[PDB]
Amino acid sequence: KETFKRIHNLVTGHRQVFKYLERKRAKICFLACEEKQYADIVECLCKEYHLCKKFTRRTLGELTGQVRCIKVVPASACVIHNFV
Amino acid sequence: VHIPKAVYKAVYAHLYENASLALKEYWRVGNVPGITYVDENGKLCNPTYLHVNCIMQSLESRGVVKDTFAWRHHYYLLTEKGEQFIRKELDLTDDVLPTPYSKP
Amino acid sequence: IVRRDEENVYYSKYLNDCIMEAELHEFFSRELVDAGYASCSLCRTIDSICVIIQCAEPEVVMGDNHYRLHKIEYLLAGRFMCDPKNFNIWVDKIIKRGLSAEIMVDNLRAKLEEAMPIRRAAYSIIRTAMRAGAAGCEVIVAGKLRANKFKEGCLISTGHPKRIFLAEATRHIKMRQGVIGVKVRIYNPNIRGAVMPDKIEIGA
Amino acid sequence: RNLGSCGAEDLDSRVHPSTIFWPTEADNASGVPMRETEFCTHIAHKRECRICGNYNSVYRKYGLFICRRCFKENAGKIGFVKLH
Amino acid sequence: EPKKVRLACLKYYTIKGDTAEPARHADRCHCG
Amino acid sequence: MHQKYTIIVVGKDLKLVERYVKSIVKEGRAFGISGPCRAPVRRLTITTRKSPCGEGTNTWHRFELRMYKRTFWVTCGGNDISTILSKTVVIPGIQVTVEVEEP
Ligand SMILES: [Zn+2]
């Protein structure tokens, strides 16, 4: 919302969140969506291991650098690996 | 083409700190002896000529720096718009200023 | 008696620095034209080179507290791989601008590209030189307009004295129709108080 | 192909690892090791005028490396003088 | 010119979030 | 103290290279600096065709660049590193007249 832009200068996607949710390299989690099999996978993998849910799916597209400025794109993710 | 971000940041930082990139006209295989980067390599690894050449071309085409060519050496120089843009990518604040302003 | 491969370093060390310079002349000509750069030099210091220049408008070359000169200072360092800071350029000034060919040719080139035609510029230049104490000038403009020459007074064009008294310069102008080759030559027979041969005097 | 090779009896014929004797001229490019496999694998000197990128008619005497044609233009500044 | 398929949630080699795995012959990420 | 130091002067122009030694020997008036050995001239030579395209009567430019050099190894350790700096400062500043000091 404010300093997050500092961080981006984190990941988005199933293939890259799993690859950082496990092995305990992650940080914080923020769920979303369309299908349970993508809602109760991570959540159950959150059951083992931080686990949180942000109110909206779009602001992730906003907070993250998925825009160019105008065309925000939704994208659920839950891995703040960098967290520098 | 798949240029690493570390190279981008290294070049930006080197430019702002020196305000000047003195580059050689080349287009074959070979690394640059100057700017440097580290990606879990254990030892800072220098960039490749193709990568930096493409980056410089994009930057100049965007109007960030100007250049002279002399013979066999692209000399570059960043404009005011340059200082106003790198500081953003390095994630800097307007207070900071290039080194050369500090009695070379 | 002596070994010929030791002094070879000293001989080869002096030759490299000569070329190290000409590149400087080219670069300045491509860059600091705004200040009408004339010539440069070099002086290998303990840890750097004390390059000094001559430009008619000293102010243009340097910036706020010489800021842009400082900018240039670092640049050269990386190109030659010398330590910054140690670099110490110097800036000079030319007094009799109507006695140097290069500043006049550059001003004339700019003027020509100001849409003004050859005649006015050439006559302005020759007037400027003659009013600056010169025996004579000669302006030649060649391109898509042949050769239209203009001359005022006496010049020498043959002999050893030419290389020291006569000073020539040349340029190229990229105009829409083609290229306008322009050159200039000035003959000052009083340079540095040197006596031109076959110039005699007798007294009472 | 990283898990393959030839017969051992043939390996005895491998070229001597002794470094190749055909280098590339550098007047002053860090020596470091898909199309990358053979972009310019062929190795050969590329001595050329340090003014004009031309590989033809270059003097190597005294370590000049200047094209003969481009020599006349800059000879005056380089110091060479035309007498005798 | 090999092609690609829309990604699916198959990496779940379990029956209740049991993380079973972290295919013809063997292979590891990258070449080694 | 004493270092068996050496003085070497290298340059192209006979005028300055001969005038500069006179000032040096002035400065070494009392430190015993003496005559310099004058090495044979290293007359570098280059020849080239005058025509970029090789037309007409074959003609040839002949440029050459000489490298005069003189040596004042006389000081040796006769002088101290303290005034070896003094040796290097009172001397005139000629734009190009390379010099180097070794023991
Ligand atoms: Zn050439």
Number of domains of chain B: 1
Describe the oligomeric state of these chains in a short phrase: part of a larger assembly
Kindly report how far apart the N and C termini of chain A lie.
16 Å
Work out the largest interface and the residue count of each chain.
Answer: B-C, 19 and 18 residues
Q: Nearest-angstrom radius of gyration of chain B?
A: 14 Å
Number of strands of chain B: 3
- Counting DSSP H or I runs of 4 or more residues, the number of helices of chain A is 4
The count of helical stretches of chain B stands at 3
Overall shape of chain A: globular
Helix amount of chain A, in percent?
25-40%
The radius of gyration over CA of chain A amounts to 12 Å
PDB class: ribosome
Keywords: Giardia lamblia, Ribosome structure, Translation, parasite
Entry title: 40S ribosomal subunit of the 80S Giardia intestinalis assemblage A ribosome with Emetine bound in V1 conformation
Chain A: Ribosomal protein S12
Topology (SSEs and partners):
This is part of a larger assembly, with chains A (84 residues), B (104 residues), C (204 residues), D (84 residues), E (32 residues) and F (103 residues).
Chain C: H1 7-31, E1 37-39, E2 52-55, H2 58-61, H3 67-80, E3 90-92, H4 101-112, H5 118-130, E4 136-143, E5 147-151, H6 161-165, E6 166-171, E7 174-175, E8 178-187
Helix pairs in contact in C: 4-5
Chain D: H1 8-11, E1 58-59, E2 66-67, H2 68-78, E3 81-82
Antiparallel strand pairs in D: 1-2
Chain E: no helix or strand
Model description:
This is part of a larger assembly, with chains A (84 residues), B (104 residues), C (204 residues), D (84 residues), E (32 residues) and F (103 residues). Chain A has helices at residues 4-8, 14-21, 40-48, 58-63. With 84 residues, chain A is an all-alpha fold. Chain D is α+β, with helices and mostly antiparallel strands and 84 residues long. Chain D has a domain at 36-83. Chain D contains two helices and three strands, in the order αββαβ. Chain D has helices at 8-11, 68-78, and strands spanning 58-59, 66-67, 81-82. In chain D, a hairpin with a 6-residue loop joins strand 1 and strand 2. The radius of gyration of chain E is 13 Å and the shape is flat. Chain E has no helix or strand. The relative contact order of chain E is 0.14. Chain F has one domain (4-99). Chain F contains two helices and six strands, in the order E-H-E-E-E-E-H-E. In chain F, strands 2-5-1-6 form a four-stranded antiparallel β-sheet, with helices on one face. Chain F has a two-stranded antiparallel ribbon with strand order 3-4. Classes of the chains: A mainly alpha (84), B alpha+beta (104), C alpha+beta (204), D alpha+beta (84), E little secondary structure (32), F alpha+beta (103). Chains in contact: A-E, B-C, B-D, C-D, C-F, D-F. The B-D interface holds B 24-26, 28-33, 46, 48-49, 71-72 and D 29-32, 36, 39-40, 50-53. Strand 3 of chain D pairs antiparallel with strand 4 of chain F, so a sheet runs across the interface. The complex binds zinc ion. Zinc ion is lined by residues 49, 51-52, 54, 67, 69-70 of chain D. Zinc ion (ZN) binds at residues 49, 51-52, 54, 67, 69-70 of chain D. Chain E: This is Ribosomal protein S27a. Chain E: It comes from Giardia intestinalis (strain ATCC 50803 / WB clone C6) (Giardia lamblia). Chain F: One of its GO terms (molecular function) is structural constituent of ribosome. Chain F: It comes from Giardia intestinalis (strain ATCC 50803 / WB clone C6) (Giardia lamblia).
